[PDB]
Design a protein around this ligand. Structure first.
Ligand SMILES: CCCCCCCCCCCCCCCCCC(=O)OC[C@H](COP(=O)(O)OC[C@H](N)C(=O)O)OC(=O)CCCCCCCCCCCCCCCCC
Ligand SMILES: *[C@@H]1O[C@H](CO)[C@@H](O[C@@H]2O[C@H](CO)[C@@H](O[C@@H]3O[C@H](CO)[C@@H](O)[C@H](O)[C@@H]3O)[C@H](O)[C@H]2NC(C)=O)[C@H](O)[C@H]1NC(C)=O
Ligand SMILES: Nc1ncnc2c1ncn2[C@@H]1O[C@H](COP(=O)(O)OP(=O)(O)CP(=O)(O)O)[C@@H](O)[C@H]1O
Ligand SMILES: *[C@@H]1O[C@H](CO)[C@@H](O[C@@H]2O[C@H](CO)[C@@H](O)[C@H](O)[C@H]2NC(C)=O)[C@H](O)[C@H]1NC(C)=O
Ligand SMILES: *[C@@H]1O[C@H](CO)[C@@H](O)[C@H](O)[C@H]1NC(C)=O
Ligand SMILES: [Mg+2]
Lengths: 376, 1044
């Protein structure tokens, strides 16, 4: 059989099992009646969630100037923002007394003097056992072509990669001691250099004289604020402490180099560094500082000591700190709910228009032979 | 690697597609070879390089264009058979090059290096240098040579044997440059915005850039801008259509495979499906407006039956043709009842003539339903009745029909032996085929001449010589010894050729009636012939033959010497009678033509036949109607030799026909006609001769002519030469901007096939010269209704939608990168984890588009033939416009806005956004957040557009949408990523990820779904109405007839 016919199958002859997707004003309505339902549902859920959580963000970028050194006074409410629902309790999270000061600090056997800001805010509801504490930085770009690739992750992992292999890496500016001595930089880079380094205290419940305990500290730990998978990237160093040096604007923390009594950081356990090294995506971003998992934050006035090291007003930026409680969606974003509700609402309006018109106004008899452009 | 790895996989997949296309088209010949193998080992054609040693044995096929340097036989000679390549049969002799005739061994080939400074492609079949003494062809067979020290000079496609086979390109594959150039325009506008904005935002010297970032890439504001510009050109790479052409190549080769493998276009006899020799023109078939057909092999079967004959003034017609059928029945007389009872009487006469034939002596080669000269008058006269000498006239005539030829005989055993009679022409073959139809069966050239069993009892005819027909003869002669010992000359041919070579003034009583019988024949719709005989003598034939040979033995100017010396015997001839030849209209043409002319396209029949047969057989093939008030263009003769007569006559004719409506020759009515394609009025038609054509195709009238030939629904061109056939194609394809198809068979129409946009070759009875020069090698004419009306309009709509979506998706990706750049000071920072940027246009979003382009169909296989008028939308070129391109790009831009700013509003405006506290909205977690909804919305948007959601398309949508999830889950879980290290568990587990994944595609698809539905309900096309009709089940009875 020397035949030459093409095999008759369901593919070569173009007969594959199909579903002719022909729109009909009974397929249009049963689609704009499913989308509207699903989106109004999910939107109601998400807006209930976003209205659940309660938080407070205090801005203090100008604490070194507009805060008297002696005693306390009121923060102008153009700094405080608060989303609670206690509805005018005796705490009113819009009256946040605040003061500034200058205090010596025992860093490591050399006792440098820093400048502190004390903030006394009010929290009118018993926040729930998971309470995070973020810092917020406006106008600070961590997303630049040079800034994001500038680190040697093979060194953050813990290695003795020395000299040329680091001199000519992507960390081009900051790779040696800005002095005579030929020295590697250990956390070398441009992103490990600029690490935000204000330090916050754990909030201290002030004594209203009604609760006998004067000031019970609300211990919030900085352990477990990074993903537990990041510790697979970092590790304890391996340089011999004689060939490393802190990055340029780390010096006020390590003024005498990396000594045996002021040793380099252990990046693996350091979970305020692994929050910086995973870069933000916008100019205005938040990062996690302190977390609490096992207790509720009772109502009352709290006090925080924020040493103000990161001078932010020098590039027209701002910085703040925010105490959030969580939901399953995240923190307070009123916008997913409203977006879902807008999409659901316009699907409902279009569903009304279609069911109404295509059922009540000119059904336009299906497939009729009068619009065929050759019957005219 | 971000650009180098795509730019190598592109050439890899292009090579692979070429390979698989060659696979599914052809579905490794041996050549002995050696520069370092130390031996002429055998190798295969896929091992071919330039300048490498070769050995070639007896009768080998050759691999490519070769040079030789030596061989075993002296003089270095080599023989070639070339019947497959060149029409001349002689074994052509090359010589192996002189200097280098000593290399004879298995390793002795290496040291004698010789330089080969050859020349580029010298396509001219008899040209090569660096003559033909060294040109070894490819398909030729190398003979009479022990071996051949092959040192070729070329290989691959650089041989003429493949080169002489005019690469055309579709109409939109040539208007795509505007779209690609506008893409680059928008890309450079984005890159210039990036440069002039980064250079500014970098010169602020107070913002957080100055303190924490130590300078720039190159310290300068206006040089930072320049580096940003070029890095942006690198980052908006996805807007490089580098992947558009490798996607269109795939969709086109796969559509062409879909029409090659169609079984509805498999003609079982010739055993050849519709092999598309030009795969890159499959969408051109969807825009055709003009079809230039033929009138033999194409419209008709080209198998000619012997219908009528008249001898001694007695005619035996007893037959009917379809031309006269239409002509008479279209009025009130002989309309329907006679239309059937006439063939009833014909069949009765068939039975009576079968009886009369079987009253004769046994001729086993006579079979029922294989006789087409049905005439009970013929057999009743040959049997003995109604004539003593008219019986002798019929016997002599019937023997002459069995002598005058050169036809060769082929017998079939088994069943009653019926003999086929093969010769060069289906014209004369019918004469001897009917000769064997009433007895007188003929056998081979039996070593003295052919053997005829006269009334079944055998006898031999010593054939002395044959003067064979040529197009410059229009007749052919055979000089044969009559069985009674004497010799006799026969000469059969047309009317104008024999009638001059007659004995002037004899048998006028018979001639003046056979000539009018010929008039009736030719006007009835046939192509008649006539036969003459002459009683020769031995000395007269000898004194002719001596000069015939002495002028034939002359090598030079032989063509005009035998016309002289052969004419010395042809002056004297006397008629034996006149005949008639019909060629049946093909089975399925009267419907294909009505269907095509119904789709809106215009039909031109460049017939090489007479004019009245052309008009009548154009009425019979549904091409003409009764409302088609055909208007004729004819300039006559007697106009001496002066063109002013001819030119002025043609001019006034054209001017009157153009005053039959608005105006003539107006290049404002031409500048306007050059831009409209509106379905010609069904009321007009033209009939133009082959003489008037030559004068109206004068350069001062063409414009005028063109306008007329745009207003009519059909045009007949009666008796055109091979020249005007291609001249009119060129005039109407270049005068107007129109598309064009040309159908034909035989080398006569190669120029018609080649000068047009699409050239279709019927594998006709004549030859394989219009197949090797065509695009699609069609079995027979009625497959046009399948090809043009199904695969044509599909393949056009499909590529329209494919390129629309391929522009849309590149826009929606790169513009959503750009939108991010507004938040990184336009300093180009990847948001997308670069491997996404290199996988997008390859895996995540390519297969669904290719599939919606290759296996999507709007109506059906059979609802597209039931309603042909849909094709009109591809005549007006309304599927791929400029408004569609801009609407799709605006759609891409809007969906980019929403598909970047929703997954940004979700995560970058909350503290944590992760519901368990930790940090998403890293720069690459946001990348995953906006890359999963984008790959969902692109594919879900090329489902909104596809018409038939079949199995493969939905399966590929699901595979493409789950592959991104799979490969993020697999690429993250490895420290090689190191910033995108565990984004799979850290993003998929979230709730905001899935909320954005379900609300971004809808917010980006709604403004198109609403338009689509409101339009398909309030401003419907024709396709959607035919679809809503094939949903009720209207054309389900058509599909029902099709499956039955
Ligand atoms: C809500 C609607 C807001 C936008 C209105 C735009 C008005 C456009 C009017 C217009 O000329 O459309 C004309 C066409 C309509 O094509 P279609 O029927 O939907 O699909 C046919 C397609 N070939 C298919 O196979 O199915 O249009 C097209 O061929 C493509 C239409 C793309 C429309 C893009 C809208 C972007 C809206 C952004 C703001 C919202
Ligand atoms: C989340 O915050 C709560 C704050 O109450 C933390 O619990 C407080 O944690 C301290 C740990 O020292 C508790 O211990 C105290 O120890 C001293 C002596 O070392 C003892 O004298 C005290 O009486 C007390 O035992 C304190 O109990 C506990 N607060 C209360 C009222 O019990 C909690 O640890 C924080 N989350 C995490 C992760 O730590
Ligand atoms: N052996 C023969 N004896 C007498 N006449 C012959 C002949 N062979 C061919 N002819 C005549 O010579 C002519 C050859 O041209 P031909 O008929 O092939 O053109 P054509 O009709 O194929 C052009 P088209 O394809 O447009 O129909 C025919 O019209 C035929 O009458
Ligand atoms: C990495 O680059 C630095 C910068 O030059 C190297 O060189 C040190 O440069 C300072 C001047 O800034 C000199 O005083 C030091 O003496 C240089 N090093 C040495 C060897 O003394 C450093 O050496 C580089 N790494 C390598 C491979 O040399
Ligand atoms: C709890 O906080 C107090 C002050 O706020 C601090 O002195 C103490 O060390 C903290 N406890 C732990 C276990 O860190
Ligand atoms: Mg022909």
């Amino acid at each position: 059989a020397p035949k030459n016919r093409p095999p008759n199958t369901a593919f070569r002859q173009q007969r594959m099992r199909a579903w002719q997707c022909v729109l009909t004003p009974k397929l249009i309505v049963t689609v704009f009646s499913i989308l509207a339902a699903i989106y109004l549902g999910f939107g109601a859920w998400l807006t209930y969630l976003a209205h659940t959580v309660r938080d407070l963000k205090i801005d203090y970028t100008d604490c070194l100037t507009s805060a008297p050194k002696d005693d306390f006074e009121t923060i102008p409410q153009n700094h405080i923002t608060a989303h609670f629902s206690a509805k005018d309790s005796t705490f009113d999270p819009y009256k946040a007394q605040w003061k500034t000061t200058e205090r010596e600090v025992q860093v490591a056997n050399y006792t440098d003097n820093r400048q502190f800001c004390i903030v006394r805010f009010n929290i009118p509801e018993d926040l729930q056992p998971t309470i995070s504490f973020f810092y917020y930085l406006e106008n600070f770009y961590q997303n630049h072509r040079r800034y994001v690739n500038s680190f040697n992750a093979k060194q953050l992992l813990g290695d003795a990669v020395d000299g040329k292999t680091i001199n000519d890496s992507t960390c081009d500016p900051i790779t040696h001691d800005p002095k005579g001595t030929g020295k590697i930089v250990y956390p070398c880079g441009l992103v490990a250099n600029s690490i935000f380094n204000d330090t916050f205290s754990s909030p201290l419940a002030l004594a209203v004289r009604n609760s006998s305990d004067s000031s019970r500290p609300y211990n919030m730990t900085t352990k477990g604020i990074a993903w537990p998978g990041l510790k697979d990237l970092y590790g304890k160093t391996s340089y011999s402490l004689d060939q490393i040096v802190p990055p340029p604007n780390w010096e006020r923390r390590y003024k005498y180099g990396y000594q045996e009594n002021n040793p380099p950081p252990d990046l693996k356990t350091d979970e305020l560094f692994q929050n910086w090294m995973m870069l933000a995506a916008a100019p205005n971003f938040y990062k996690l500082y302190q977390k609490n998992d096992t207790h509720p934050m009772l109502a009352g006035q709290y006090e925080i000591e924020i040493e103000s090291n990161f001078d932010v007003t020098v590039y027209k930026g701002r910085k703040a700190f925010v105490i959030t409680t969580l939901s399953t969606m995240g923190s307070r974003n009123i916008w997913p709910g409203i977006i879902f509700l807008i999409v659901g609402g316009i699907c409902l309006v279009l569903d009304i228009y279609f069911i109404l018109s295509f059922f009540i106004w000119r059904p336009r008899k299906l497939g009729d032979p009068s619009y065929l452009s050759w019957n005219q | 690697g971000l650009n180098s790895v795509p730019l190598i996989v592109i050439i890899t997949v292009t090579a692979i597609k070429d390979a698989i296309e060659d696979y599914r088209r052809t579905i490794n010949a041996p050549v002995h070879r050696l520069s370092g193998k130390a031996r002429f080992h055998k190798d295969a054609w896929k091992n071919l390089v330039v300048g490498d040693f070769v050995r070639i044995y007896n009768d080998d096929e050759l691999p490519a264009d070769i040079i030789i340097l030596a061989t075993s036989d002296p003089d270095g000679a080599c023989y070639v058979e070339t019947k497959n390549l060149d029409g001349e049969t002689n074994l052509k002799v090359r010589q192996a090059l002189r200097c280098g005739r000593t290399l004879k061994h298995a390793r002795d080939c290496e040291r004698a290096q010789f330089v080969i400074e050859s020349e580029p492609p010298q396509p001219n079949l008899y040209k090569y240098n660096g003559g033909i003494d060294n040109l070894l062809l490819r398909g030729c067979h190398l003979r009479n040579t022990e071996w051949a020290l092959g040192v070729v000079v070329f290989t691959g496609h650089d041989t003429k044997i493949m080169m002489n086979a005019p690469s055309k390109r579709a109409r939109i594959a040539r208007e795509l440059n505007f779209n690609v150039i506008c893409n680059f325009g928008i890309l450079l506008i984005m890159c210039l915005i990036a440069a002039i904005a980064n250079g500014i935002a970098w010169g602020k010297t107070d913002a957080s850039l100055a303190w924490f970032e130590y300078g720039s890439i190159g310290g300068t504001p206006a040089l930072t801008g320049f580096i940003t510009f070029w890095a942006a050109v690198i980052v908006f790479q996805n807007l490089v259509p580098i992947s558009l052409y490798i996607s269109l190549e795939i969709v086109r080769t796969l559509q062409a495979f879909f029409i090659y493998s169609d079984v509805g276009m498999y003609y079982e006899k010739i055993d050849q499906p519709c092999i598309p020799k030009s795969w890159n023109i499959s969408d051109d078939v969807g825009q055709i407006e003009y079809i230039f057909s033929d009138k033999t092999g194409t419209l008709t079967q080209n198998v000619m039956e012997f219908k009528k004959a008249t001898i001694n003034g007695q005619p035996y017609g007893e037959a009917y043709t379809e031309a006269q059928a239409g002509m008479d029945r279209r009025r009130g007389i002989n309309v329907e009842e006679e239309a059937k009872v006439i063939r009833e009487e014909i069949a009765a006469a068939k039975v009576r003539a079968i009886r009369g034939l079987r009253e004769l002596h046994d001729n086993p080669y006579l079979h029922d339903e294989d006789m087409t000269f049905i005439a009970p008058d013929f057999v009743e006269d040959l049997a003995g009745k109604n004539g003593p000498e008219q019986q002798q006239a019929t016997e002599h005539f019937m023997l002459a029909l069995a002598l005058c030829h050169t036809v060769v005989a082929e017998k079939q055993p088994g069943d009653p032996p019926k003999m086929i009679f093969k010769a060069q022409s289906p014209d004369e073959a019918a004469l001897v085929a009917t000769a064997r139809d009433m007895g007188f069966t003929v056998l081979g050239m039996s070593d003295g001449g052919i053997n005829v069993n006269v009334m079944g009892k055998d006898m031999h005819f010593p054939v002395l010589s044959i003067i064979e027909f040529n197009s410059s003869r229009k007749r052919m002669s055979t000089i044969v010894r009559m069985p009674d010992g004497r010799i006799l000359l026969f000469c059969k041919g047309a009317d104008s050729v024999i009638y001059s070579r007659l004995k002037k003034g004899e048998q006028a009583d018979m001639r003046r009636e056979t000539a009018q019988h010929l008039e009736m024949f030719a006007v009835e719709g046939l192509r008649t012939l006539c036969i003459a005989e002459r009683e020769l003598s031995e000395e007269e034939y000898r004194e002719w033959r001596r000069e015939h040979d002495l002028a034939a033995t002359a090598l030079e100017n032989r063509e005009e010497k035998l016309e002289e010396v052969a004419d010395k015997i042809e002056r004297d001839l006397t008629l034996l009678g006149g005949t008639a030849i019909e060629d049946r209209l093909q089975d399925g043409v009267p419907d294909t033509i009505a269907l095509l002319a119904d789709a809106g396209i215009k039909l031109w029949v460049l017939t090489g036949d007479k004019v009245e047969t052309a008009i009548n057989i154009g009425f019979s093939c549904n091409l003409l109607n009764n409302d088609m008030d055909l208007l004729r263009l004819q300039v006559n003769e007697s106009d001496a030799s002066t063109e002013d007569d001819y030119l002025q006559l043609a001019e006034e004719q054209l001017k009157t026909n153009l005053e039959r409506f608005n105006m003539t020759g107006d290049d404002e009515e031409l500048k306007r006609a050059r831009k409209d394609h509106n379905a010609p009025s069904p009321t007009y038609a033209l009939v133009i001769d082959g003489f008037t054509l030559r004068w109206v195709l004068s350069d001062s009238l063409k414009q005028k002519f063109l306008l007329l030939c745009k207003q009519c629904k059909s045009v007949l061109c009666c008796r055109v030469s091979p020249a005007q056939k291609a001249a009119v194609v060129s005039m109407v394809k270049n005068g107007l901007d129109v598309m064009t198809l040309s159908i034909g068979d035989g080398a006569n129409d190669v120029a018609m096939i080649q000068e047009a946009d699409v050239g279709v070759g019927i594998a006709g009875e004549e030859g394989r010269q219009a197949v090797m020069s065509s695009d699609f090698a069609i079995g027979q004419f009625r497959f046009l209704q399948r090809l043009v009306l199904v695969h044509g309009r599909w393949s056009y709509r499909r590529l329209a939608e494919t390129i629309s979506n391929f522009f849309y998706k590149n826009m929606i990706w790169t513009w959503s990168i750009f939108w991010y750049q507004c938040y990184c000071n336009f300093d180009i920072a990847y948001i997308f984890e670069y491997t996404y940027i290199l996988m997008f246009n390859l895996f995540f979003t390519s297969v669904p588009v290719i599939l919606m382009g290759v296996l999507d169909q709007d109506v059906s296989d059979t609802v597209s033939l039931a309603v042909p008028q849909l094709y009109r939308r591809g005549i007006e070129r309304k599927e791929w416009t400029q408004t569609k391109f801009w609407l799709y790009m605006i759609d891409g831009v809007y969906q980019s806005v929403m598909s970047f700013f929703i997954p940004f509003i979700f995560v970058v405006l909350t503290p944590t956004a992760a519901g368990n506290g930790l940090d998403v909205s890293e720069r690459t977690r946001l990348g995953a957040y906006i890359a999963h909804p984008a790959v969902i919305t692109i594919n879900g948007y090329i489902l909104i557009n596809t018409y038939r959601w079949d199995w493969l398309m939905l399966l590929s949508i699901v595979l493409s949408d789950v592959f991104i999830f799979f490969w993020t889950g697999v690429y993250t879980a490895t420290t090689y990523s190191a910033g995108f290290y565990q984004a799979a568990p850290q993003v998929y587990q979230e709730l905001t990820f899935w909320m954005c994944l379900i609300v971004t595609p809808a917010l980006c698809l709604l403004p198109r779904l609403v338009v689509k539905c409101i339009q398909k309900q309030r401003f419907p096309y024709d396709v959607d109405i035919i679809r809503e009709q094939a949903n009720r089940g209207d054309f389900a009875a058509a599909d029902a007839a099709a499956v039955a």
